[PDB]
Structure formats: C-alpha cells, structure tokens
Amino acid sequence: LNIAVLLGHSHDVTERELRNLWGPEQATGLPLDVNVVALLMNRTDPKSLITHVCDLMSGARIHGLVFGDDTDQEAVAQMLDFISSQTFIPILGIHGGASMIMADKDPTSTFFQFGASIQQQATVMLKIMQDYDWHVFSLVTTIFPGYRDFISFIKTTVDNSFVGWDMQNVITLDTSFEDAKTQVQLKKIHSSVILLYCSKDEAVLILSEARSLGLTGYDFFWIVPSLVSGNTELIPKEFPSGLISVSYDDWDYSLEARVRDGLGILTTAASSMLEKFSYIPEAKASCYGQPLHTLHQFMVNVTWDGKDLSFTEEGYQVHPRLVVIVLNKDREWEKVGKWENQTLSLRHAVWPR
Amino acid sequence: KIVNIGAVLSTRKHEQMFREAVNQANKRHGSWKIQLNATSVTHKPNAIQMALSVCEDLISSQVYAILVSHPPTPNDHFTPTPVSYTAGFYRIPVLGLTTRMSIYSDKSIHLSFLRTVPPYSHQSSVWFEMMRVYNWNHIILLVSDDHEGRAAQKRLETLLEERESKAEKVLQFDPGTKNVTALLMEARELEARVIILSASEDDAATVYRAAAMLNMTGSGYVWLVGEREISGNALRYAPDGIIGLQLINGKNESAHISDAVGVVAQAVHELLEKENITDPPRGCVGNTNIWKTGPLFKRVLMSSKYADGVTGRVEFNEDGDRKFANYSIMNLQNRKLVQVGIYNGTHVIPNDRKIIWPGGETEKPRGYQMSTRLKIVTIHQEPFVYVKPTMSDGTCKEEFTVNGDPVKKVICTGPNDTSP
Lengths: 353, 420
Ligand SMILES: *[C@@H]1O[C@H](CO)[C@@H](O)[C@H](O)[C@H]1NC(C)=O
Ligand SMILES: *[C@@H]1O[C@H](CO)[C@@H](O)[C@H](O)[C@H]1NC(C)=O
Ligand SMILES: *[C@@H]1O[C@H](CO)[C@@H](O)[C@H](O)[C@H]1NC(C)=O
Ligand SMILES: *[C@@H]1O[C@H](CO)[C@@H](O)[C@H](O)[C@H]1NC(C)=O
Ligand SMILES: *[C@@H]1O[C@H](CO)[C@@H](O)[C@H](O)[C@H]1NC(C)=O
Ligand SMILES: *[C@@H]1O[C@H](CO)[C@@H](O)[C@H](O)[C@H]1NC(C)=O
Ligand SMILES: *[C@@H]1O[C@H](CO)[C@@H](O)[C@H](O)[C@H]1NC(C)=O
Ligand SMILES: *[C@@H]1O[C@H](CO)[C@@H](O)[C@H](O)[C@H]1NC(C)=O
Ligand SMILES: *[C@@H]1O[C@H](CO)[C@@H](O)[C@H](O)[C@H]1NC(C)=O
Ligand SMILES: *[C@@H]1O[C@H](CO)[C@@H](O)[C@H](O)[C@H]1NC(C)=O
Ligand SMILES: *[C@@H]1O[C@H](CO)[C@@H](O)[C@H](O)[C@H]1NC(C)=O
What we know:
This is part of a larger assembly, with chains A (353 residues) and B (420 residues).
Chain A: E1 3-7, H1 16-20, E2 36-40, H2 46-56, E3 65-67, H3 75-86, E4 92-93, E5 112-113, H4 118-131, E6 137-142, H5 148-159, E7 171-173, H6 182-187, E8 193-197, H7 200-212, E9 222-224, H8 226-229, E10 243-247, H9 255-274, E11 323-327, E12 333-339, E13 344-345
Parallel strand pairs in A: 1-2, 1-3, 4-5, 6-7, 6-8, 9-10
Antiparallel strand pairs in A: 10-11, 11-12, 12-13
Chain B: E1 4-8, H1 12-24, E2 37-40, H2 48-59, E3 66-68, H3 81-89, E4 94-96, E5 113-115, H4 120-133, E6 140-143, H5 147-163, E7 169-172, H6 181-188, E8 194-198, H7 201-214, E9 222-224, H8 233-236, E10 243-247, H9 253-273, H10 294-302, E11 327-332, E12 337-343, E13 348-349
Parallel strand pairs in B: 1-2, 1-3, 3-4, 4-5, 6-7, 6-8, 8-9
Antiparallel strand pairs in B: 10-11, 11-12, 12-13
Helix pairs in contact in B: 1-9, 4-5
The structure holds 2-acetamido-2-deoxy-beta-D-glucopyranose (11 copies).
One 2-acetamido-2-deoxy-beta-D-glucopyranose binds at residues 213-215 of chain B.
Protein name (chain A): Glutamate receptor ionotropic, NMDA 2A
Family (chain A): Belongs to the glutamate-gated ion channel (TC 1.A.10.1) family. NR2A/GRIN2A subfamily.
Subcellular location (chain A): Cell projection, Dendritic spine; Cell membrane; Synapse; Postsynaptic cell membrane
C-alpha cells in the first residue's frame, strides 16, 4: 500500500536510501498502489505531525506512516495512537520515542511497537545478574508512574526464586531531595546492584546525591532500563563509573533494516488481506468535511526475511534484539550485550569493574 | 512577552463569558504585568482538522494551559484526546471538562490529562453508600466494557475490602452481541436480586431489552443505575421506577466554564508567584528543546487547594478528580425524572418525595433468596450422616427406632466412591 516514511536526524540516517529502498525491492507486490513518500522534519512537534497527516492522507490515500523520533518520551507514539483511534491505520513503532516501552496499551488501538516489554526486560536484567553472580540487590523507585508492574514482577520473581535472591525493601521517594530523611534510606543500602526506575532528571539528581555522599563505589553498581537512561546522544552530568543501561539505541545497527522489515510486514499484511477482502483502502479520506476491516489481529502471523518478526498480544515483537551498554571512564556508551531468540548471549565473559 | 490562552470554545455567549473571565482574571490576582488574550476555534465535523487548528493556535503562540468545553461533540467518538496528547508532547497538562471515563483516569496512556469531574468510581462509591443505608450485602455486577470495567471492579473490591466482605457474582462480556438473556437467566438463580449495571448506552439498551423479554421488572428487583443508563434509548427502555444519578451544576455550561477559567487562572498566577518561568518552544527549524519544568508544574497543580467556585469547593486529589461532589439521586416515575434525594460528599438526604421502585412498596426491594435455596453439603461420617441406597427408585424406607421415633430420611445425592 501507499506508505509514507518520515525521519529526523537520528544515527546520521539520510533520506536518499528511503528512495532507493523502493526501486529494486518490493518484487512480489500484490497491491498495485504501492508508493513511498520520504520526508524529513527538523523539529519534533505535533503541528508538523498533524500537517503531514492532513497532507499525506489526502495525498492519494496513504495508509502507512513511519516516524523517527529522537526524544525521551513514549507518548510521541501516543500521538500515532490518535492516528490509530480515528483513521485506524496500523503504525509500526520503529525507533526512538515512537517505540519506547509504556505500561498498558488498549486492544481497540491498531498501533504496534518494536521491542520487549518491561517484564521481559526485567527478565533479561535478572538473567544478567544471575550470570554475573550478584545476588544481593536493592530497589529504589520514585513516584513516577508505571511502577506497580515492575515492583510486582520483582516480588513474584524473588518469592519464586530458584537462586535465593536477597531482595532489599523498596526505597520510595515521595518528594525531592532534602538530605534529612533520604540519607537514612541511602545509608541502609549496602547491596551490590541498586535498581532505579524514574525519569531522566530525577536519575541525574539521585546519581549526583549518590556521588556527593560516596554511594558510587565499585561494589555499588547501577543498572538502568531504557526509560531511565534514554537516548545515547545526550549524556548529562554526574554519572558514576559502572552504569549499565539496557536499551535499543544502537549506532551501528541499521535503521534501514528496521524500515525495510516494517515495509515488509505491512506489504505482507496487505497481500494477505487482498486475498480475503477486495476494498483494501477503507479509512478516512481527508481532513475536510466528514471501522470494518483492520490489520491489528491479522498480521500477527507475519514473517519477513526469515526473522521471527511476529506480534504479541500486547502489541510488541515476540523476539526483538535487546542492547546492553556500559559506561566507561571515557564518557562513552559502548554496546556489550545482545539477546538471542530464546537464551541470552554474553560477549565479554570477564566482567570489568 | 505575549500570552495566548488555548480555549476550544465556539458558542458566542460563552465567548463573551470567557472574555469577561479573562478580563477578571487579571484584576485582583496581583500586580503582575502580564496580559491575557483569547484564542478560540470554530466547528469542524472531524477531530483531526480541529487538532490542526488547535495546535496552530498553540505552538505558534507560546500558550500556558488549554480548556476544552464542548460536551456536545458532533461525532460519536467523544475524544478530548488529540489536544491533550499534543500538550503532553510538551509535558503540558490539559484540564478536560467533558469526559468521565476511567481510561482517562489511568496515568499510563494519559500522562497528564487532568479534569474537574469525577469518574464512575465515585458513582460506585455512592452506590456502596446506598448499600450501607438499607444494609445491602449480596450484589450482582454486570459490566459490558473492559477499559473502565477493570477500574470499577477494583474500586468495588476496595469498597468490599473496607467492609471486609465478598461479592456474589460479577459478569464481564463482549459488547455488540444480543445473546445476553442466558446470562440474566443464570443470574436469576443466584442468592440475591440486586442488579448493578456499568455499561454504555447501547449495551444498557440491549440488557434492558433482554430484561423486558425475560420479565426482570417484577418484585424485589433492585434498579440502581448511573448516568449513561438514563440517556438515549436506555432512558426509553428503562422500567418505571429506576434510580439514576444527576450532576448538580455539571450540565450548566456557563458557570462550569467560568469556574474552570478561575481555577486555571489561579493555577497560572500561582505558578507565576514562584521562579523558573519557562515557555513552550516553537516548531519551525532545528531546535528540539524539551520543556524542563514538567514536575515543577505537576507539583504546583496536583497539590493545589481551592476555595472559590460557583459549583462548589473544588480540590485536586492524587488522580486529579473532584472532591465532595453534589449529586441528585433521581427516580424515573412514569418516564419522568423525579427528584427523590440529594447528596453531599458525606451524607445522603432524601427530600419529602416518595422513592417508588418497580417492585413492592416505597421501601427497599425485598430481593433476598439466600435462605430459600441452601446447598447443604456434608461428609460421609459414620455415626452422623448415614447414607443408604434406595429400594427401587429414589424412595426412602421409613425405618423404626426403639423409642417410637420414625427415621426421617431425606433424598440426598450420594456418590459411590472418589475419583480414583
Ligand atoms: C531540515 O529539514 C530539511 C527537509 O525539510 C532537510 O533538507 C535539511 O537537511 C534539514 N536540516 C537540518 C540539518 O536540520
Ligand atoms: C494468519 O492469521 C489469519 C487470521 O488473523 C488467518 O486468516 C491466516 O490464514 C493466517 N495465515 C497467514 C500467514 O496469513
Ligand atoms: C532467531 O530465529 C530466526 C528464525 O526464526 C533465525 O533466522 C535467527 O538467526 C535467530 N536469531 C538468533 C540466533 O537469535
Ligand atoms: C493582547 O493583544 C493585544 C493586541 O494585539 C496586544 O497589544 C497585547 O500585547 C496582547 N497581550 C499580551 C501581552 O498577551
Ligand atoms: C445468538 O445465538 C444464536 C443461536 O441461538 C446465533 O445464531 C446468533 O448468531 C447469536 N448472535 C446474536 C444474534 O446475538
Ligand atoms: C413476560 O410478560 C408478558 C406480559 O405480562 C407475558 O405476556 C409473557 O408471557 C412473559 N414471558 C416472557 C416472554 O418472559
Ligand atoms: C442549570 O442546570 C439545571 C439542571 O441541573 C437546569 O434545570 C437549569 O435550567 C440550568 N440553568 C441554567 C443557568 O442554564
Ligand atoms: C529553579 O531551577 C533551578 C535549576 O533546576 C533549581 O536549582 C532551583 O531550585 C529552582 N528554583 C526554585 C526556587 O525551585
Ligand atoms: C454542594 O452544595 C452546597 C450548597 O447546597 C455547598 O455548600 C457545597 O460546597 C457543595 N459541595 C461540596 C463541595 O461540599
Ligand atoms: C450539604 O451541606 C450544606 C452545608 O455545607 C447544606 O447547606 C446543604 O443543605 C447540604 N445538602 C444536602 C445534601 O441537603
Ligand atoms: C460401588 O462401588 C463398588 C466398588 O468399590 C461396587 O462393587 C458397587 O457395585 C458400587 N455400587 C454401590 C454399592 O454404590
């Protein structure tokens, strides 16, 4: 189908390869109205988003939008959810803020993301902690939302642990730093891994408070998810040596492969829907003067280029590619760990301290 | 240096009231030298062109807060979602004034969609307080939806944990179908007749049609519904004597808009009392700077105490709702809304009218049958429960004891052995 691809300036990805991706590829094109519109926008803003919606959906009925975000917010993808709630156009979250992991989606929305959820990411992080023999840990969680499922998964893992994980009690931060009552909570932490689930600036303040009080030793590790750390371009101040982040922002990984897999899944869905129902374009025509067949529960059994690109029941990939990066003394983030289909792969066997 | 107020508002009398409230918001709210101008949008059939006009009014004008005040939406979507998501891109909360769904109460999808109206969990709390008046324990729950249904079931389990009791039977099915008669027939044979419904308008009309085809409007049936079940065809298909709820100063649009502008303007001036005054950026070329005073504005708004208002004392809780909501317990006596009670936040006061139910008298509906059908379970104890096979077919031989007492056998259902 007609699918428009828009990008920004993430990972030095240009726009001419989006034009070259249509010519020699798409050989088994069962729809006839398969065209691409490659676009770039300098700023991230909803004004240009709704402008390209009202300018491309009226542009010969484009039923596909690819967006590349470089912010630190998953609600940008929620903007695409408004395309999934009115026009009911299936949008694949590719990379950046349009594919970050949030808590609970809706079954009525036809929107999808690429990546593993917070439960599978916690499973990967606990597999890392089990392979490195770091049993005694901590858990410091703020009042940032999406905290019940993560703490509940840690509690159900420790209560059903085959290893015997020594779980320290939950350190809660209802207010900001005062250095009157939170200092007692910081002095009780004598574990190895200090878990953290909060925003970006709150993480900067907590790591600055830990650096100012000497809680950033070699024994005191800091393992953060993609929501706490964020993108790999912006690196703020007061980060301790020994910060292990779990994300997907990889510099040498191809965004062209991401958009090629997205176009392959969407054209496979369109070719499988063409054999069932005739009128494939059935959506909102234009933004001037106002569902029966959607592709939400139809392209679950998709497979492109031999890879397991199937969809889950929550709107995610079944086996994505996880990235585990570390922070060295050179103020850089280097990729260390990657995730396999079933098990977990570890490149560096000897772990540096 | 200019400040424009985002207001999705088109009715001209409310435009004059909005301009008067903007003029009054800078009079006694301090000697600060800021000015406030109005920016309104017109009617469009869709919601994407509405969102385009709104975001063109927002990003190119450096706005502070947004007010959406159209409860008669032209479409059947009823979504204040695109303006709230547009401002939530810049971490800006939107105080919506129309919707009351529990999908807007979740802080995962809607990160900062605040509101001055309570959700349906407060109506479930009012139903639970009406359970405390007539001592209602066993209830039947029927919920069609699944987004608000999980929050309603969680709030009902929280209230029953506050009572330290248990529910009888809950039902959650798929809307759109019409085979809901068998579920109501299975709910007929329960231990009580209290019916609680939490659904949309079409699902309420469907279950009212199924209750009319099964004659569930007899004696003892408790009819206690809310707002969505007394609107549209669900108002038409409801039996005479059904109990609903009505908002006090909620349907009055002008006073609600004036109170909302007062609360938002007091929040803006309270944010201007302190330092770190930032503005939302533009969207033209090459500057992707994010808004840094998100948690500061959240600490200002979510911990705000108010005392002014035409509707009442408004106060934001931890979820951004309305405290001490005045309700009207209404009765539908012969297709006419009859005022039979009013509701402060702590006590229910009925008026001098009669609460007429579709069952018996003006008292509570006697729908208790948890003693007329008792599943007496027992274990095969040797001196206590003698179990004996029948003679020919289901008969009991009247044995004779030594004291003239005839053996009064009961027809029980006995198995031979266990599963192995
Ligand atoms: C800005 O966007 C235009 C396309 O609209 C693109 O040609 C240009 O390279 C971009 N400039 C930068 C570096 O932001
Ligand atoms: C995939 O699933 C759909 C139902 O969603 C089914 O109709 C179809 O036969 C299945 N096979 C493929 C790979 O299309
Ligand atoms: C995962 O499985 C696919 C086949 O479904 C295979 O092509 C791919 O190489 C596997 N990747 C690994 C080893 O993680
Ligand atoms: C409001 O509009 C008037 C007329 O355009 C303008 O002179 C005034 O500066 C504006 N007020 C502010 C500061 O927003
Ligand atoms: C309801 O049940 C009947 C069978 O009794 C079935 O034919 C029908 O499709 C179902 N759907 C409706 C009308 O609710
Ligand atoms: C229900 O009530 C009507 C009117 O009294 C009666 O005719 C009918 O037999 C009853 N039975 C049904 C259909 O539930
Ligand atoms: C306000 O609302 C009530 C219903 O709650 C209505 O009877 C009354 O006419 C309304 N008054 C105004 C000012 O519109
Ligand atoms: C204003 O912001 C700065 C930097 O975040 C902070 O240090 C300061 O405490 C803030 N001012 C107040 C009074 O909160
Ligand atoms: C309800 O209305 C009464 C006046 O009848 C008013 O005093 C009260 O403030 C309102 N509700 C609240 C906020 O308790
Ligand atoms: C609610 O409380 C106010 C006093 O705060 C009182 O004036 C009013 O009559 C009460 N409303 C009811 C429920 O009668
Ligand atoms: C019950 O089970 C036994 C075997 O355990 C069998 O011999 C007998 O015929 C069965 N009938 C009775 C007495 O219920």
